[PDB]
Protein backbone atom coordinates (compact mmCIF):
# COMPACT_ATOMS: atom_id res chain seq x y z
CA UNK A 1 0.00 0.00 0.00
CA UNK A 2 2.36 2.70 1.29
CA UNK A 3 5.30 0.38 0.57
CA UNK A 4 7.06 0.12 -2.82
CA UNK A 5 7.99 -3.54 -2.23
CA UNK A 6 5.65 -6.50 -2.75
CA UNK A 7 7.79 -8.58 -0.37
CA UNK A 8 9.53 -7.74 2.91
CA UNK A 9 11.96 -10.17 4.54
CA UNK A 10 12.25 -9.70 8.29
CA UNK A 11 15.90 -10.56 8.93
CA UNK A 12 17.65 -11.42 12.20
CA UNK A 13 21.20 -12.43 13.12
CA UNK A 14 22.40 -13.82 16.43
CA UNK A 15 26.14 -13.89 17.12
CA UNK A 16 28.80 -15.14 19.48
CA UNK A 17 29.41 -12.66 22.29
CA UNK A 18 30.88 -11.92 25.70
CA UNK A 19 28.58 -9.32 27.25
CA UNK A 20 31.28 -7.60 29.34
CA UNK A 21 33.62 -7.18 26.35
CA UNK A 22 32.84 -5.18 23.20
CA UNK A 23 36.25 -5.90 21.67
CA UNK A 24 34.83 -9.19 20.43
CA UNK A 25 34.91 -10.73 16.92
CA UNK A 26 31.18 -11.46 16.68
CA UNK A 27 30.40 -14.41 14.40
CA UNK A 28 26.91 -15.28 13.17
CA UNK A 29 25.54 -18.41 14.86
CA UNK A 30 21.90 -18.17 13.78
CA UNK A 31 20.39 -16.91 10.52
CA UNK A 32 16.63 -16.26 10.63
CA UNK A 33 14.24 -14.79 8.06
CA UNK A 34 10.46 -14.59 7.75
CA UNK A 35 8.62 -13.21 4.72
CA UNK A 36 5.85 -10.60 4.81
CA UNK A 37 3.39 -10.25 1.93
CA UNK A 38 2.79 -6.51 1.58
CA UNK A 39 -0.14 -6.40 -0.86
CA UNK A 40 -2.05 -9.20 0.88
CA UNK A 41 -0.98 -8.10 4.37
CA UNK A 42 0.08 -11.61 5.41
CA UNK A 43 2.94 -12.81 7.60
CA UNK A 44 4.12 -15.96 5.82
CA UNK A 45 5.57 -18.12 8.59
CA UNK A 46 5.59 -20.97 6.07
CA UNK A 47 8.04 -18.90 4.02
CA UNK A 48 11.09 -18.77 6.27
CA UNK A 49 14.83 -19.37 6.43
CA UNK A 50 16.21 -20.58 9.76
CA UNK A 51 19.71 -22.04 10.11
CA UNK A 52 22.32 -22.36 12.82
CA UNK A 53 25.89 -21.39 11.92
CA UNK A 54 29.18 -22.82 13.19
CA UNK A 55 31.66 -20.09 14.27
CA UNK A 56 35.41 -20.64 13.74
CA UNK A 57 37.14 -17.93 15.81
CA UNK A 58 35.31 -18.73 19.06
CA UNK A 59 33.84 -22.21 18.80
CA UNK A 60 32.57 -22.49 22.38
CA UNK A 61 29.62 -20.24 23.18
CA UNK A 62 30.06 -18.34 26.43
CA UNK A 63 27.42 -18.96 29.08
CA UNK A 64 26.01 -15.44 28.74
CA UNK A 65 25.82 -15.88 24.96
CA UNK A 66 23.77 -19.06 25.38
CA UNK A 67 21.50 -17.39 27.95
CA UNK A 68 20.94 -14.43 25.62
CA UNK A 69 20.50 -16.20 22.28
CA UNK A 70 18.89 -19.38 23.61
CA UNK A 71 21.22 -21.36 21.33
CA UNK A 72 22.67 -24.58 22.79
CA UNK A 73 26.27 -25.61 22.07
CA UNK A 74 25.17 -28.84 20.39
CA UNK A 75 23.25 -26.88 17.75
CA UNK A 76 26.31 -25.01 16.43
CA UNK A 77 28.65 -28.00 16.74
CA UNK A 78 26.52 -29.74 14.10
CA UNK A 79 26.00 -26.62 11.96
CA UNK A 80 27.66 -25.47 8.74
CA UNK A 81 30.03 -22.50 8.60
CA UNK A 82 28.68 -19.14 7.44
CA UNK A 83 29.89 -19.46 3.85
CA UNK A 84 27.79 -22.60 3.36
CA UNK A 85 24.71 -21.20 5.10
CA UNK A 86 24.99 -17.94 3.16
CA UNK A 87 25.13 -19.95 -0.07
CA UNK A 88 21.97 -21.79 1.00
CA UNK A 89 20.42 -18.41 1.76
CA UNK A 90 21.14 -17.12 -1.74
CA UNK A 91 19.62 -20.23 -3.32
CA UNK A 92 16.59 -19.80 -1.07
CA UNK A 93 16.00 -16.34 -2.56
CA UNK A 94 16.22 -17.83 -6.06
CA UNK A 95 13.89 -20.70 -5.14
CA UNK A 96 11.31 -18.18 -3.93
CA UNK A 97 11.60 -16.50 -7.33
CA UNK A 98 12.51 -13.13 -5.82
CA UNK A 99 13.89 -10.49 -8.18
CA UNK A 100 16.71 -8.03 -7.53
CA UNK A 101 15.51 -4.81 -5.91
CA UNK A 102 11.85 -5.84 -5.70
CA UNK A 103 12.20 -6.92 -2.08
CA UNK A 104 13.86 -5.40 0.99
CA UNK A 105 15.07 -6.63 4.36
CA UNK A 106 13.56 -5.35 7.61
CA UNK A 107 15.44 -5.21 10.92
CA UNK A 108 14.84 -3.71 14.37
CA UNK A 109 18.11 -1.76 14.16
CA UNK A 110 21.21 -1.08 12.07
CA UNK A 111 23.14 -3.73 13.98
CA UNK A 112 22.10 -6.76 11.92
CA UNK A 113 23.35 -5.51 8.54
CA UNK A 114 25.65 -2.54 9.20
CA UNK A 115 27.70 -4.32 11.90
CA UNK A 116 27.01 -8.05 12.12
CA UNK A 117 26.61 -8.77 8.41
CA UNK A 118 29.46 -6.47 7.36
CA UNK A 119 31.91 -7.96 9.88
CA UNK A 120 30.95 -11.57 9.13
CA UNK A 121 31.35 -10.87 5.41
CA UNK A 122 34.91 -9.74 6.11
CA UNK A 123 35.68 -12.89 8.11
CA UNK A 124 34.28 -15.06 5.32
CA UNK A 125 35.87 -12.90 2.62
CA UNK A 126 32.48 -12.44 0.95
CA UNK A 127 31.52 -9.30 -0.95
CA UNK A 128 28.82 -7.26 0.76
CA UNK A 129 25.69 -7.95 -1.33
CA UNK A 130 23.59 -5.17 -2.84
CA UNK A 131 20.47 -6.23 -0.92
CA UNK A 132 22.33 -5.82 2.40
CA UNK A 133 23.46 -2.28 1.53
CA UNK A 134 19.88 -1.02 1.51
CA UNK A 135 17.28 -1.97 4.11
CA UNK A 136 14.47 -0.91 6.42
CA UNK A 137 15.31 0.14 9.97
CA UNK A 138 11.92 -0.47 11.55
CA UNK A 139 12.81 1.28 14.81
CA UNK A 140 13.66 4.43 12.87
CA UNK A 141 10.18 4.40 11.35
CA UNK A 142 8.78 3.70 14.80
CA UNK A 143 10.49 6.89 15.97
CA UNK A 144 8.71 8.90 13.27
CA UNK A 145 5.40 7.19 14.01
CA UNK A 146 5.79 8.10 17.68
CA UNK A 147 5.94 11.86 17.07
CA UNK A 148 3.03 11.48 14.66
CA UNK A 149 0.70 9.60 17.04
CA UNK A 150 1.97 11.29 20.20
CA UNK A 151 4.79 10.03 22.46
CA UNK A 152 4.63 7.60 25.37
CA UNK A 153 7.14 7.08 28.19
CA UNK A 154 8.00 3.43 27.60
CA UNK A 155 9.19 1.03 30.29
CA UNK A 156 10.79 -1.51 27.93
CA UNK A 157 14.55 -1.41 27.38
CA UNK A 158 14.92 -2.93 23.88
CA UNK A 159 13.77 -1.82 20.42
CA UNK A 160 11.41 -4.76 19.99
CA UNK A 161 10.32 -4.42 23.61
CA UNK A 162 9.51 -0.73 23.20
CA UNK A 163 7.60 -1.25 19.95
CA UNK A 164 5.56 -4.10 21.44
CA UNK A 165 4.74 -1.97 24.49
CA UNK A 166 3.72 1.02 22.35
CA UNK A 167 1.20 -0.89 20.24
CA UNK A 168 0.31 -3.11 23.22
CA UNK A 169 1.43 -6.28 21.44
CA UNK A 170 2.00 -9.51 23.40
CA UNK A 171 5.68 -10.46 23.35
CA UNK A 172 6.07 -13.47 21.07
CA UNK A 173 8.19 -16.12 22.79
CA UNK A 174 8.11 -19.68 21.43
CA UNK A 175 11.58 -20.74 20.28
CA UNK A 176 13.24 -18.07 22.43
CA UNK A 177 15.79 -17.40 19.68
CA UNK A 178 16.34 -15.49 16.41
CA UNK A 179 13.05 -16.63 14.86
CA UNK A 180 11.13 -15.15 17.80
CA UNK A 181 12.69 -11.77 17.05
CA UNK A 182 11.68 -12.20 13.41
CA UNK A 183 8.08 -12.96 14.38
CA UNK A 184 7.92 -10.02 16.79
CA UNK A 185 9.35 -7.60 14.22
CA UNK A 186 6.97 -8.97 11.58
CA UNK A 187 3.93 -8.51 13.82
CA UNK A 188 5.11 -5.02 14.73
CA UNK A 189 5.69 -4.28 11.05
CA UNK A 190 2.18 -5.47 10.23
CA UNK A 191 0.49 -3.53 13.03
CA UNK A 192 2.45 -0.42 12.08
CA UNK A 193 1.16 -0.18 8.50
CA UNK A 194 -2.31 -1.06 9.76
CA UNK A 195 -1.97 1.97 12.04
CA UNK A 196 -1.01 3.88 8.89
CA UNK A 197 2.79 3.78 9.00
CA UNK A 198 4.75 4.34 5.78
CA UNK A 199 7.41 1.64 5.49
CA UNK A 200 10.33 2.01 3.06
CA UNK A 201 14.12 1.73 2.81
CA UNK A 202 15.39 4.42 5.19
CA UNK A 203 19.04 3.38 5.58
CA UNK A 204 21.79 2.77 3.02
CA UNK A 205 25.38 1.55 3.30
CA UNK A 206 27.89 3.80 1.53
CA UNK A 207 31.68 3.71 1.20
CA UNK A 208 32.47 7.18 2.55
CA UNK A 209 31.34 9.91 4.94
CA UNK A 210 32.66 13.36 5.82
CA UNK A 211 32.27 12.82 9.58
CA UNK A 212 34.93 10.07 9.48
CA UNK A 213 37.50 12.46 8.02
CA UNK A 214 38.64 13.62 11.46
CA UNK A 215 40.11 11.02 13.87
CA UNK A 216 37.80 9.61 16.54
CA UNK A 217 38.36 10.99 20.03
CA UNK A 218 39.51 7.75 21.64
CA UNK A 219 37.81 6.59 24.84
CA UNK A 220 40.09 4.14 26.65
CA UNK A 221 37.19 2.35 28.37
CA UNK A 222 35.24 1.79 25.15
CA UNK A 223 35.35 -2.00 25.52
CA UNK A 224 32.90 -1.87 28.44
CA UNK A 225 30.43 0.41 26.63
CA UNK A 226 28.24 -0.74 23.73
CA UNK A 227 27.71 2.93 22.91
CA UNK A 228 31.37 3.96 22.74
CA UNK A 229 32.20 0.66 21.04
CA UNK A 230 29.76 1.70 18.32
CA UNK A 231 31.95 4.70 17.54
CA UNK A 232 34.92 2.36 17.09
CA UNK A 233 32.91 0.00 14.88
CA UNK A 234 31.92 2.94 12.67
CA UNK A 235 35.54 3.78 11.82
CA UNK A 236 36.79 0.20 11.52
CA UNK A 237 34.04 -1.10 9.24
CA UNK A 238 34.43 0.16 5.64
CA UNK A 239 30.74 0.88 4.93
CA UNK A 240 28.83 3.54 6.87
CA UNK A 241 25.11 3.95 7.53
CA UNK A 242 23.59 6.72 5.42
CA UNK A 243 20.11 7.98 6.19
CA UNK A 244 17.81 8.48 3.23
CA UNK A 245 14.85 10.75 3.91
CA UNK A 246 11.25 9.71 3.32
CA UNK A 247 10.11 10.06 -0.29
CA UNK A 248 13.69 10.14 -1.59
CA UNK A 249 14.18 6.40 -2.16
CA UNK A 250 13.81 4.97 -5.67
CA UNK A 251 13.92 1.27 -6.58
CA UNK A 252 16.50 2.03 -9.28
CA UNK A 253 18.96 2.90 -6.51
CA UNK A 254 19.53 -0.85 -6.19
CA UNK A 255 22.39 -1.71 -6.44
CA UNK A 256 24.41 1.48 -6.80
CA UNK A 257 26.35 3.07 -3.95
CA UNK A 258 24.71 6.38 -3.11
CA UNK A 259 28.07 8.07 -2.51
CA UNK A 260 30.51 7.01 -5.25
CA UNK A 261 27.69 6.18 -7.69
CA UNK A 262 29.40 2.95 -8.74
CA UNK A 263 28.12 -0.62 -8.77
CA UNK A 264 28.30 -2.41 -5.43
CA UNK A 265 30.34 -5.09 -7.22
CA UNK A 266 33.20 -2.56 -7.44
CA UNK A 267 32.41 -0.36 -4.44
CA UNK A 268 33.12 -1.90 -1.03
CA UNK A 269 36.20 -3.84 -2.13
CA UNK A 270 38.61 -1.62 -0.19
CA UNK A 271 38.24 0.60 2.87
CA UNK A 272 38.17 4.22 1.68
CA UNK A 273 38.76 5.84 5.09
CA UNK A 274 41.06 3.46 6.97
CA UNK A 275 41.37 4.72 10.58
CA UNK A 276 45.17 4.54 10.84
CA UNK A 277 45.04 6.70 13.98
CA UNK A 278 43.37 3.80 15.79
CA UNK A 279 45.91 1.24 14.55
CA UNK A 280 49.22 2.76 15.71
CA UNK A 281 49.23 1.91 19.43
CA UNK A 282 50.30 -1.71 19.88
CA UNK A 283 49.99 -1.46 23.67
CA UNK A 284 46.21 -1.19 23.21
CA UNK A 285 45.31 -3.06 19.99
CA UNK A 286 41.76 -3.41 18.64
CA UNK A 287 41.35 -7.19 18.84
CA UNK A 288 38.29 -7.55 16.58
CA UNK A 289 39.93 -5.37 13.93
CA UNK A 290 43.23 -7.25 14.16
CA UNK A 291 41.75 -10.74 13.91
CA UNK A 292 39.47 -9.81 11.00
CA UNK A 293 42.50 -8.45 9.15
CA UNK A 294 41.66 -4.74 8.99
CA UNK A 295 45.23 -4.09 10.12
CA UNK B 1 65.40 -36.59 51.62
CA UNK B 2 64.10 -35.43 48.24
CA UNK B 3 65.69 -37.70 45.61
CA UNK B 4 65.77 -34.86 43.05
CA UNK B 5 68.50 -32.22 42.75
CA UNK B 6 66.21 -29.88 40.80
CA UNK B 7 62.49 -29.26 41.20
CA UNK B 8 60.66 -27.28 38.54
CA UNK B 9 57.57 -25.47 39.78
CA UNK B 10 55.12 -25.58 36.87
CA UNK B 11 51.97 -23.56 36.23
CA UNK B 12 49.56 -23.62 33.29
CA UNK B 13 46.81 -21.08 32.67
CA UNK B 14 44.06 -21.69 30.13
CA UNK B 15 41.15 -20.26 28.21
CA UNK B 16 38.01 -20.57 30.33
CA UNK B 17 34.41 -19.60 30.99
CA UNK B 18 33.83 -20.00 34.73
CA UNK B 19 30.10 -20.75 34.51
CA UNK B 20 30.71 -23.61 32.06
CA UNK B 21 32.85 -26.69 32.74
CA UNK B 22 32.13 -28.20 29.32
CA UNK B 23 34.86 -26.02 27.86
CA UNK B 24 37.83 -27.01 25.67
CA UNK B 25 40.53 -25.39 27.85
CA UNK B 26 43.63 -24.33 25.89
CA UNK B 27 46.96 -23.32 27.42
CA UNK B 28 47.53 -19.55 27.17
CA UNK B 29 50.47 -19.18 29.56
CA UNK B 30 53.35 -21.54 30.30
CA UNK B 31 55.30 -20.70 33.47
CA UNK B 32 58.15 -22.51 35.22
CA UNK B 33 60.63 -21.58 37.95
CA UNK B 34 63.50 -23.71 39.26
CA UNK B 35 64.29 -24.78 42.81
CA UNK B 36 67.77 -26.02 43.69
CA UNK B 37 67.24 -28.70 46.34
CA UNK B 38 70.78 -29.26 47.71
CA UNK B 39 71.39 -25.52 48.13
CA UNK B 40 67.80 -24.82 49.22
CA UNK B 41 67.53 -21.91 46.78
CA UNK B 42 64.70 -20.63 44.62
CA UNK B 43 66.27 -19.71 41.28
CA UNK B 44 64.15 -16.91 39.81
CA UNK B 45 66.87 -16.30 37.22
CA UNK B 46 66.20 -19.84 35.94
CA UNK B 47 62.67 -19.71 34.58
CA UNK B 48 60.49 -20.35 31.55
CA UNK B 49 57.60 -17.96 30.92
CA UNK B 50 55.72 -17.66 27.64
CA UNK B 51 52.24 -16.89 26.40
CA UNK B 52 50.45 -19.33 24.09
CA UNK B 53 48.00 -18.58 21.27
CA UNK B 54 44.80 -20.68 21.48
CA UNK B 55 42.96 -21.74 18.28
CA UNK B 56 39.55 -23.08 19.37
CA UNK B 57 38.61 -19.95 21.31
CA UNK B 58 40.84 -17.11 20.21
CA UNK B 59 39.12 -14.38 22.24
CA UNK B 60 39.56 -14.55 26.00
CA UNK B 61 36.35 -14.21 27.99
CA UNK B 62 36.37 -11.29 30.41
CA UNK B 63 36.28 -13.66 33.38
CA UNK B 64 39.30 -15.56 32.01
CA UNK B 65 41.18 -12.27 31.68
CA UNK B 66 40.31 -11.31 35.27
CA UNK B 67 41.36 -14.68 36.68
CA UNK B 68 44.59 -15.20 34.74
CA UNK B 69 45.54 -11.53 34.44
CA UNK B 70 46.46 -12.19 30.81
CA UNK B 71 45.56 -9.46 28.28
CA UNK B 72 44.17 -10.32 24.84
CA UNK B 73 47.06 -8.59 23.09
CA UNK B 74 49.56 -10.93 24.74
CA UNK B 75 48.00 -14.09 23.25
CA UNK B 76 47.33 -12.46 19.87
CA UNK B 77 51.08 -12.09 19.26
CA UNK B 78 52.01 -15.42 20.90
CA UNK B 79 52.93 -18.75 19.29
CA UNK B 80 50.72 -21.85 19.29
CA UNK B 81 51.29 -24.51 21.94
CA UNK B 82 53.31 -26.90 19.76
CA UNK B 83 55.82 -24.11 19.15
CA UNK B 84 56.05 -23.03 22.79
CA UNK B 85 56.24 -26.67 23.85
CA UNK B 86 59.26 -27.09 21.56
CA UNK B 87 60.88 -24.00 23.11
CA UNK B 88 60.21 -25.47 26.54
CA UNK B 89 61.95 -28.73 25.65
CA UNK B 90 64.98 -26.88 24.28
CA UNK B 91 65.04 -24.82 27.48
CA UNK B 92 65.27 -28.02 29.55
CA UNK B 93 68.11 -29.36 27.40
CA UNK B 94 69.96 -26.03 27.64
CA UNK B 95 69.85 -26.26 31.44
CA UNK B 96 71.57 -29.63 31.15
CA UNK B 97 68.56 -31.14 32.91
CA UNK B 98 68.79 -34.92 32.60
CA UNK B 99 65.45 -36.71 32.25
CA UNK B 100 64.29 -38.62 35.33
CA UNK B 101 66.61 -36.62 37.60
CA UNK B 102 64.28 -33.63 38.01
CA UNK B 103 60.56 -33.38 38.77
CA UNK B 104 57.71 -30.94 38.29
CA UNK B 105 55.90 -29.45 41.28
CA UNK B 106 52.29 -28.29 41.08
CA UNK B 107 49.74 -27.02 43.61
CA UNK B 108 47.29 -29.68 42.39
CA UNK B 109 46.58 -32.39 39.83
CA UNK B 110 44.97 -29.88 37.47
CA UNK B 111 48.06 -28.61 35.63
CA UNK B 112 49.31 -31.99 34.38
CA UNK B 113 46.47 -34.53 34.73
CA UNK B 114 43.82 -32.23 33.20
CA UNK B 115 45.30 -29.22 31.42
CA UNK B 116 48.44 -30.79 29.96
CA UNK B 117 46.65 -33.99 28.91
CA UNK B 118 43.87 -32.14 27.11
CA UNK B 119 46.23 -29.67 25.42
CA UNK B 120 48.45 -32.55 24.30
CA UNK B 121 45.35 -34.15 22.77
CA UNK B 122 44.47 -30.97 20.87
CA UNK B 123 48.07 -30.55 19.68
CA UNK B 124 48.27 -34.27 18.88
CA UNK B 125 51.43 -34.65 20.98
CA UNK B 126 52.17 -37.79 22.99
CA UNK B 127 52.16 -37.17 26.74
CA UNK B 128 55.84 -36.94 27.80
CA UNK B 129 57.27 -39.08 30.60
CA UNK B 130 58.20 -36.05 32.73
CA UNK B 131 54.52 -35.00 32.77
CA UNK B 132 53.37 -38.49 33.85
CA UNK B 133 55.07 -38.25 37.23
CA UNK B 134 55.05 -35.16 39.42
CA UNK B 135 54.76 -33.68 42.89
CA UNK B 136 51.32 -32.61 44.05
CA UNK B 137 52.43 -30.20 46.75
CA UNK B 138 48.95 -29.82 48.24
CA UNK B 139 48.63 -33.57 48.80
CA UNK B 140 51.97 -33.56 50.63
CA UNK B 141 50.79 -30.57 52.66
CA UNK B 142 47.54 -32.35 53.51
CA UNK B 143 49.33 -35.60 54.35
CA UNK B 144 51.76 -33.80 56.68
CA UNK B 145 49.12 -31.89 58.64
CA UNK B 146 49.00 -34.15 61.70
CA UNK B 147 52.77 -33.86 62.10
CA UNK B 148 52.78 -30.08 61.63
CA UNK B 149 49.79 -29.37 63.87
CA UNK B 150 46.15 -28.30 63.38
CA UNK B 151 45.14 -24.81 62.24
CA UNK B 152 41.88 -23.20 61.11
CA UNK B 153 42.19 -21.90 57.55
CA UNK B 154 39.75 -19.50 55.88
CA UNK B 155 41.41 -19.62 52.44
CA UNK B 156 39.62 -21.50 49.65
CA UNK B 157 42.48 -22.21 47.20
CA UNK B 158 45.38 -24.64 47.63
CA UNK B 159 47.99 -21.90 47.35
CA UNK B 160 45.90 -19.73 49.66
CA UNK B 161 45.54 -22.40 52.34
CA UNK B 162 49.24 -23.27 52.26
CA UNK B 163 50.33 -19.61 52.44
CA UNK B 164 47.90 -18.94 55.29
CA UNK B 165 49.08 -22.00 57.21
CA UNK B 166 52.75 -20.96 57.09
CA UNK B 167 51.88 -17.27 57.51
CA UNK B 168 53.42 -16.54 54.11
CA UNK B 169 52.58 -13.24 52.37
CA UNK B 170 50.86 -13.72 49.01
CA UNK B 171 53.34 -13.06 46.21
CA UNK B 172 51.63 -10.78 43.70
CA UNK B 173 54.10 -9.30 41.22
CA UNK B 174 52.50 -9.61 37.78
CA UNK B 175 49.26 -11.28 38.89
CA UNK B 176 49.77 -14.10 36.39
CA UNK B 177 51.03 -17.68 36.04
CA UNK B 178 54.48 -16.72 37.32
CA UNK B 179 53.05 -15.53 40.64
CA UNK B 180 51.67 -19.03 41.20
CA UNK B 181 55.12 -20.45 40.50
CA UNK B 182 56.78 -18.11 42.99
CA UNK B 183 54.16 -18.81 45.67
CA UNK B 184 54.40 -22.57 45.21
CA UNK B 185 58.21 -22.32 45.18
CA UNK B 186 58.20 -20.34 48.43
CA UNK B 187 55.76 -22.77 50.06
CA UNK B 188 57.82 -25.71 48.81
CA UNK B 189 60.97 -24.27 50.36
CA UNK B 190 59.22 -23.69 53.69
CA UNK B 191 57.74 -27.19 53.75
CA UNK B 192 61.13 -28.77 53.04
CA UNK B 193 62.72 -26.75 55.84
CA UNK B 194 59.94 -27.88 58.20
CA UNK B 195 60.78 -31.50 57.38
CA UNK B 196 58.20 -32.37 54.72
CA UNK B 197 59.01 -35.48 52.66
CA UNK B 198 58.90 -33.89 49.21
CA UNK B 199 58.93 -36.43 46.38
CA UNK B 200 56.76 -37.69 43.51
CA UNK B 201 53.34 -38.72 44.85
CA UNK B 202 51.22 -38.86 41.68
CA UNK B 203 51.69 -40.96 38.55
CA UNK B 204 49.65 -40.91 35.35
CA UNK B 205 48.47 -44.36 34.30
CA UNK B 206 46.63 -45.78 31.28
CA UNK B 207 44.07 -48.02 33.03
CA UNK B 208 42.16 -48.06 36.32
CA UNK B 209 39.71 -50.60 37.73
CA UNK B 210 37.33 -47.81 38.77
CA UNK B 211 36.72 -46.92 35.11
CA UNK B 212 35.48 -50.43 34.27
CA UNK B 213 31.92 -49.48 35.22
CA UNK B 214 30.25 -46.53 33.46
CA UNK B 215 29.97 -43.27 35.40
CA UNK B 216 26.52 -42.43 36.77
CA UNK B 217 25.70 -39.31 34.76
CA UNK B 218 25.01 -36.05 36.60
CA UNK B 219 22.99 -33.91 34.20
CA UNK B 220 24.14 -30.71 35.93
CA UNK B 221 27.88 -31.44 35.83
CA UNK B 222 28.60 -28.41 33.63
CA UNK B 223 27.85 -25.99 36.48
CA UNK B 224 30.07 -27.73 39.05
CA UNK B 225 33.85 -28.10 39.07
CA UNK B 226 33.62 -31.12 41.38
CA UNK B 227 30.97 -32.95 39.35
CA UNK B 228 32.83 -32.04 36.15
CA UNK B 229 35.96 -33.68 37.56
CA UNK B 230 34.22 -37.05 37.46
CA UNK B 231 33.57 -36.51 33.75
CA UNK B 232 37.15 -35.41 33.05
CA UNK B 233 38.37 -38.57 34.79
CA UNK B 234 36.57 -40.75 32.24
CA UNK B 235 37.17 -38.66 29.12
CA UNK B 236 40.91 -38.17 29.60
CA UNK B 237 42.96 -41.29 28.75
CA UNK B 238 45.40 -41.17 31.68
CA UNK B 239 44.38 -41.64 35.30
CA UNK B 240 45.99 -40.24 38.45
CA UNK B 241 47.65 -42.97 40.49
CA UNK B 242 48.76 -42.15 44.03
CA UNK B 243 52.02 -43.46 45.49
CA UNK B 244 52.90 -42.93 49.14
CA UNK B 245 56.03 -41.07 50.18
CA UNK B 246 59.09 -43.32 50.11
CA UNK B 247 57.66 -45.80 47.59
CA UNK B 248 58.68 -43.78 44.55
CA UNK B 249 62.04 -44.55 42.98
CA UNK B 250 63.89 -42.78 40.16
CA UNK B 251 63.90 -45.93 38.01
CA UNK B 252 60.12 -45.56 37.66
CA UNK B 253 60.63 -42.75 35.14
CA UNK B 254 59.21 -43.48 31.70
CA UNK B 255 57.36 -46.70 32.57
CA UNK B 256 53.60 -46.99 33.16
CA UNK B 257 52.71 -48.46 36.56
CA UNK B 258 49.85 -50.47 35.06
CA UNK B 259 50.98 -51.96 31.74
CA UNK B 260 54.68 -51.73 32.70
CA UNK B 261 55.43 -50.47 29.17
CA UNK B 262 57.54 -47.50 28.14
CA UNK B 263 55.62 -44.23 27.91
CA UNK B 264 56.56 -44.13 24.22
CA UNK B 265 54.20 -47.07 23.65
CA UNK B 266 51.74 -46.40 26.47
CA UNK B 267 49.69 -43.23 26.00
CA UNK B 268 49.18 -43.72 22.27
CA UNK B 269 45.45 -44.27 22.63
CA UNK B 270 42.65 -44.17 25.21
CA UNK B 271 42.36 -47.66 26.73
CA UNK B 272 39.00 -47.09 28.47
CA UNK B 273 36.98 -44.78 26.20
CA UNK B 274 33.68 -43.96 27.95
CA UNK B 275 31.38 -44.75 25.02
CA UNK B 276 28.45 -44.70 27.45
CA UNK B 277 28.99 -40.93 27.78
CA UNK B 278 28.97 -40.38 24.01
CA UNK B 279 25.61 -41.96 23.07
CA UNK B 280 23.28 -39.00 23.65
CA UNK B 281 23.12 -36.54 20.75
CA UNK B 282 20.66 -34.45 22.77
CA UNK B 283 23.34 -33.84 25.42
CA UNK B 284 26.81 -34.15 23.85
CA UNK B 285 30.06 -33.59 25.74
CA UNK B 286 31.36 -30.58 23.80
CA UNK B 287 34.96 -30.60 25.04
CA UNK B 288 35.28 -34.30 24.23
CA UNK B 289 33.74 -33.97 20.77
CA UNK B 290 35.79 -30.99 19.61
CA UNK B 291 38.98 -32.67 20.85
CA UNK B 292 38.18 -35.82 18.86
CA UNK B 293 37.78 -38.30 21.71
CA UNK B 294 34.83 -39.55 19.68
MG1 LIG C 1 18.17 -9.29 17.43
MG1 LIG D 1 47.21 -22.27 38.96
ZN1 LIG E 1 30.68 3.72 -2.71
ZN1 LIG F 1 50.19 -47.92 30.45
From Swiss-Prot, chain A:
The keyword Manganese does not apply. Mg(2+) binds at residues 12, 14, 181. Homodimer (via C-terminus). Interacts with crn-5; interaction promotes the DNase activity of crn-4. Interacts with cps-6, crn-1 and cyn-13. GO terms for cellular component: cytoplasm. Keywords: Apoptosis, Exonuclease, Hydrolase, Magnesium, Metal-binding, Nuclease, Zinc. Residues 9-189 form the Exonuclease domain. Possesses 3'->5' exoribonuclease activity in digestion of DNA and RNA. Cleaves nucleic acid substrates with efficiencies in the following order: single-stranded RNA (ssRNA) > double-stranded DNA (dsDNA) > single-stranded DNA (ssDNA). Involved in apoptotic DNA degradation. The gene is crn-4. Pfam families: RNase_T. One of its GO terms (biological process) is DNA catabolic process. It comes from Caenorhabditis elegans. Its EC number is 3.1.-.-. Zn(2+) binds at residues 207, 257, 260, 267. Changing residue 112 to A: Reduces DNase activity. Abolishes DNase activity. This is 3'-5' exonuclease crn-4. Its cofactor is Mg(2+). It comes from the Eukaryota. GO terms for molecular function: 3'-5' exonuclease activity; 3'-5'-RNA exonuclease activity; DNA endonuclease activity; DNA nuclease activity; metal ion binding; RNA nuclease activity; single-stranded DNA binding.
Amino acid sequence: QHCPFDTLLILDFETTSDAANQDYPCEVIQFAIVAYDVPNDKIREDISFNKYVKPVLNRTLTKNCVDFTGIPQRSIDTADTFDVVYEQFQQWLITLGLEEGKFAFVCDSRQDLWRIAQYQMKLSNIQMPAFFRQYINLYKIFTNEMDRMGPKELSATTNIGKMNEYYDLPTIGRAHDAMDDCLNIATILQRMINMGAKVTVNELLTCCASWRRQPLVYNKEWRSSFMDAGKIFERVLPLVVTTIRAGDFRLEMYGVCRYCRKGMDVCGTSHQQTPHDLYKNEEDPIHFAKIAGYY
